[PDB]
Amino acid sequence: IPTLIADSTKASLQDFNHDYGKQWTFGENWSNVNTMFETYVNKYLFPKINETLLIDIALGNRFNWLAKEQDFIGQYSEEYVIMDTIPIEMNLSKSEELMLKRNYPQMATRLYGSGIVKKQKFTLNNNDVRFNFQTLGDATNYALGVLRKKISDINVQEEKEIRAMMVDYAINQLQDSNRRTASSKEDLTERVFEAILNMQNNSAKYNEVHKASGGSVGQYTTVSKLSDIAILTTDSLKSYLLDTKIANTFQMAGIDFTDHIISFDDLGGVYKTTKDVTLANEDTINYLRAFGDYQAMIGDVIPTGSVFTFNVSDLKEFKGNIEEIKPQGELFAFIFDINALKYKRNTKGMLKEPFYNGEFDEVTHWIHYYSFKAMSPFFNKILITEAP
């Protein structure tokens, strides 16, 4: 009946929400005669549910392979390479004192830094979640489901960050020589296909050892084998590249261009703070909480360069202080050797011990892990982007 349903005095919430609630219940009569749920044979029985689905969609980090477990102790990572030496003629006429000549080896280097540690938590209540499920078994599935969703969240976030790292690196921290310009979408496909082959050539031009401390003067010739090359492009661009006949001839040969090319619809959606904003409003903290941020409180300072990973631009403190990490212009192909993405991670004692509140009968569980993400200057990278 519409009125009975409307009354909230008769609610489980009222008893749990407040002290001194009503102990004894005399059942309320129920009828479906003019309501939805009316059944031809038995008008008065309460509606009964066949199933609670619990649909769960597994999501994954495409870049999860190419992740190196680290057993962390210590912070920095060195990453050296040894510079090239060109073979020379015998020149037997030269003085015998040439035997004594040092010829020391030479090298380049890059000290990366340390990695951030991230956390998530879910609180499970013994007392009232039980009201929701018909059977104990469905409730146990619900608990597994929250843990699995948390694991799925780590994966989507890491994938987003690795993708953003590449977009940011390409747009800002790249050797100018590596960059290329494409007038039209058609030209880009020609340029991208020309580039795949260029990496396989043994040449020092594509690599960024000119940076990387080490030697501006010498040469390091790096080669990127097929199977170690992949192209970060937008989804529309991937469609154009696959459409071309060259892609078909490659697949016929045996190299799957489709797996190699990696695409996201916009290569955007990860946001970077600019201008050192500080949380100041209740409304903002509530939005952040909807997205899972228990830790945030008013007066907390968010440093410049903080990566939000969700759109916080609308919120007031961040209104003029958020810039999206996205390819500028529709055309954007960043072709990189796969080995470049340093993506070391530590996942031990991943699921931390539970804490039982004991008042409210609730247990809070936490998942903690260490992630380090960086890109190396040594391997070949080329960026093809629309001409200014």
Partner: peptide
């Protein structure tokens, strides 16, 4: 599309912090 591995046991440091089996 692989996933983060859910669990392995804590490093030697982790266990010794939790227990302090002094020796």
């Amino acid at each position: 599309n692989m996933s983060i591995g859910t669990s392995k046991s804590e490093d030697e440091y982790g266990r010794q912090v939790h227990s302090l089996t002094k020796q």
